Amino acid sequence: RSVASSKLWMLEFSAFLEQQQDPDTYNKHLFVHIGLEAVDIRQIYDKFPEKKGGLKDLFERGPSNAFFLVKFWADLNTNGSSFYGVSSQYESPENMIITCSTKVCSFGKQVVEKVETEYARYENGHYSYRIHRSPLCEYMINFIHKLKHLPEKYMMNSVLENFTILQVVTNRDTQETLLCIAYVFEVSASEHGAQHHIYRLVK
């Protein structure tokens, strides 16, 4: 359990493109997937929204054990019959109503936000939450299109330097930060496809 505070653990996260070849045949490509060294949070504050409710405000309010930075190397090697989606799964000892707020940022400015409410399912003494095949927003689809249509790989990384995602998972009733994950991106150059490093964010 890497991405885990005291109250919530993210077991699974992936962004994918699923293509329907025919009614019985589907090809799925994963862009990124999950399924701890410390980083000075001050080194990344500029890459994320500021002011009240922003990364700094959230981190200062705590708890500090809820804050993570994920570095993704994204696999972009993939080709009206397409679905761009994201799936994620969480476990908790507690039965909560949680809100998952995902912000896409460019040069630290919020460009789009997706907000999702999730209820618990009892599963083996604990509770599971699943965001199943959430449609990827058009901005993200468009961003991926533009990325792949850049001449050179070095250009993709130059664009990605200033593209981040902030995911904040909150107890809806109490507004306690259960998980806050900052996502940073490079393009995968590896023969093993998508990779990742997970860090604890510290003061």
């Binding site: 570095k71 468009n142 250009m155 130059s158 330097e161 200033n162 990779q195």
Partner: protein, 40 residues
């Protein structure tokens, strides 16, 4: 003043002569762990 929109973002990299996006410290030049740029 600089722009911060989708076309401007890619334009800045495709045609650097006409770039008008905020300027930043490259991640490689920041105080970050070595593993940050060495994938597994």
């Amino acid at each position: 003043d600089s722009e911060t929109d989708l076309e401007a973002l890619f334009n800045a990299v495709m045609n650097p002569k006409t770039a008008n996006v905020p300027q930043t410290v490259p991640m490689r030049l920041r105080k970050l762990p070595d593993s940050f740029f060495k994938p597994p």
